[PDB]
């Protein structure tokens, strides 16, 4: 029952909500360029006493980096950003609490490794690992780091058959964990362009390792739990604003949060139309409570 | 269909019934670079008895003629003379045939190959030019640099085989080529793992194919076993009559399944991946498909047929 948002309805909701959780890409900005009116509306929400949070499935930037980008583009400051890097670090903290010196093989960014380092998890394998040796015997003979207790698959632009081989070898130990930052098929880019998502890499590792990975990012509930551990979210008085139906809006529906769809990003009203037709009850979960052309549309009520 | 143990008498009955024998290579004829004991003698005897022998492989790393050299070196024999034709059908050659048929009429077909030099050689033989074989290491600081790399014009297919040089760059180029609707996506096999000696394994081609499928939001066409195209690739040259042909294999999900779906008599050899315990599990109907994966006859090794060939 997607309602079209008007200034009157926006005022009504704003009275009801104290916390707003936003996806960054496709909602607040595309690339390094801000959505028209978005910085001012978020500044105004802060002035009206609303608490702002940010949830992202990208593992390439640290919390402080996302916060600096928000500050430079005028969105303000209080941390308020919850990305798959930080939340992956928290997951590994929880699942490796008993390990004395946990080490993880990270097919991912320096930011993911830094976030793991902050929670006490040493990371190995960030960066290039180009193929060496002419056959499987050479590839399977390469020495591995000792005491590796987890394999974390993030956005690895250096992904190679060597990293897949080392990951599978680490995962031959039953105690070893397999964690994926997200399961997205595509990473949205500017101008409607896209590149391969972390989900492709994670699925390669899963298939080779005959394992099912634990997914940290949206639509997984783990990212909401990571936000709630610090915010203490009240589902009834909290709203999730997002651009993608399969990740942001589904997360909102599963966690009983109010949902707003912004049409500045990947998803559009036509997609919601197909979802409103009952092919599956799940697709009904992928429908927003309200829709806005842009987040600046909250400025009339603010 | 009751997985009968092939006794020498039963084996002789089979020899009278079949004129053509199709063998899987790894786990049946040889393990790695070392031959299975007694297999070379058995196949040489089969050639002497006038039986026609063919070979089916899911590995895309060797050309037909190269496989023939390995067979000759290990004592399995070779095509007799000038009239005789090649006996080995691997995923490189049959992938080339698949693109030959599916790119019929294309003026100068080009393919982006995440695969071996052998696959490129076979494609050249069928008239398909190949681009992208070999390493493509990461360059640049961001997506704009990666997406600024120039792509070749008139690429009409993406072929994913065993690529140990697979990289995020090659995946990115593959999706960019596949953004063209006419472009085909072909996979040599969908195996999650490549079996190796001593129970070891490495990641299979299926992982690479799946990554490309997910990013391109496409479904790949698989050439290798259990897909029936490899059987059609054999038949295009052999002209097989299914009831008078036997398929010998080591793996239930690939070799024996191909035999059953193509109405070939099946012999399971226990020198490879599959065991009688696995066929036991399949004989218990957990899945409808598992009934298809049951051998008509079983032997510990193909050398077990040597008494009936003398």
Author numbering:
A (entry chain A): 12 to 89, 96 to 319
B (entry chain B): 11 to 320
Which text from the study accompanies this structure?
Phosphoglycolate phosphatase (PGP, also called glycerol 3-phosphate phosphatase or AUM11) is an evolutionarily conserved metabolite damage control enzyme that can dephosphorylate and thereby repair three adventitious glycolytic metabolites: 2-phospho-L-lactate, 4-phosphoerythronate, and 2-phosphoglycolate. PGP belongs to the haloacid dehalogenase (HAD)-type superfamily of phosphatases, a large, widespread and evolutionarily ancient class of hydrolases with emerging roles in human physiology and disease. All HAD phosphatases consist of a catalytic core domain with a Rossmanoid-fold. This core is accessorized with so-called cap domains, which are mobile elements that can shield the entry to the catalytic cleft.
We had shown earlier that PGP exists in a dynamic equilibrium between homodimers and -tetramers, and that the mutation of Cys297 to Ser (PGPC297S) abolished disulfide-mediated PGP tetramer formation. For subsequent crystallization attempts, we additionally exchanged the catalytically essential Asp34 to Asn, which abolishes PGP activity towards its substrates. Full-length murine PGPD34N/C297S (here referred to as apo-PGP) crystallized in space group P1 with four dimers per asymmetric unit, referred to as AB, CD, EF and GH dimers. While monomers A-F and H are well defined in the electron density maps, large sections of the catalytic core of monomer G display very weak density. An inspection of the PGP catalytic cleft showed that the active site of PGP is organized as a channel, and that Asn34 (corresponding to the Asp34 nucleophile) is centrally buried within this cleft. Coupled to this rotation is a shift of the substrate specificity loop (amino acids 202–215) by up to ~6 Å for corresponding Cα atoms towards the catalytic core. Conversely, the cap domains (Cα atoms of residues 100–237) can be superimposed, which then identifies a movement of the PGP ‘flap’ (amino acids 39–46 of the core domain) by >5 Å towards the catalytic core. Upon rotation of the substrate specificity loop and the flap, channel entrances become obstructed, and access to the active site is blocked. To our knowledge, experimental proof for the existence of open (chains D and E) and closed (chains A-C, F and H) conformations in a C2-capped mammalian phosphatase has not been previously provided.
